[PDB]
Design a protein around this ligand. Structure first.
Ligand SMILES: [Mg+2]
Length: 228
């Protein structure tokens, strides 16, 4: 048996994302739309900065901008917290430490609004260097990929995760972003508390040749692994 929430993901699901951000006082908003097909761990999304120019690099916002779309192998379906929390949803919180630079703190609510999966986020960044790789826009517009390591957090009826993102700098070096994550259900029903495992995630970044607004197109694959 799969969670009741998992039943909501058997087809292609529309996705909406809304983010309000403030990084060193630079305020901005992002809207996104697309679709997810969890059977294949597959997402296609387009994001637009609705306030003008984005004041940080797009790659630094990818992880913030719906892990309920992960493909869990049949043998791992009892470990999918994210879908189990649906439709009422979950809160996803992170702190993201950019090595030798500032940090993002994020709080999001991910839930269904009818048949649409919605991710609403607030992001606050502090302590960035004005001429660092973030505020100085020194990060290449490059894919990110890595493993999200998940553990249960029984005391909050949820999960924690940690991972690293190695962003390529234009000079050939690396800007590390150390992620710390916690997710807690919004509803009061039972959820699936997992054994340790990870999400293997790959995000490909591109541009819409017809789009003049500041934007990001993503094609992403997310697959659970690490058990059997
Ligand atoms: Mg301070």
């Amino acid at each position: 048996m799969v969670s009741k929430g998992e039943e909501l993901f058997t087809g292609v699901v529309p996705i909406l994302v809304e983010l309000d951000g403030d990084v060193n006082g630079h305020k901005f908003s992002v809207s996104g739309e697309g679709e997810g097909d969890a059977t294949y761990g597959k997402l296609t999304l387009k994001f637009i900065c609705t306030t003008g120019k984005l004041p940080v690099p797009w790659p630094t916002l990818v992880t913030t901008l719906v892990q309920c779309f992960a493909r869990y192998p049949d043998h791992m379906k009892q470990h999918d917290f994210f879908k189990s929390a649906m439709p009422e949803g979950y809160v996803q919180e992170r702190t993201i430490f950019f090595k030798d630079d500032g940090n993002y703190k994020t709080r999001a609510e991910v839930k269904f609004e009818g048949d649409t999966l919605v991710n609403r986020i607030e992001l606050k960044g502090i302590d960035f260097k004005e001429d660092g790789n973030i505020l100085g826009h020194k990060l290449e517009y490059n894919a990110i990929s890595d493993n999200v390591y998940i553990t249960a957090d029984k005391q909050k009826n949820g999960i924690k995760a940690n991972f690293k993102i190695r962003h390529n700098i234009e000079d050939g070096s690396v800007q590390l972003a150390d992620h710390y994550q916690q997710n807690t259900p919004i509803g009061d029903g039972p959820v699936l508390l997992p054994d340790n495992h990870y999400l293997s995630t790959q995000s490909a970044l591109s541009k819409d040749p017809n789009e003049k607004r500041d934007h990001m197109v993503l094609l992403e694959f997310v697959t659970a692994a690490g058990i059997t």
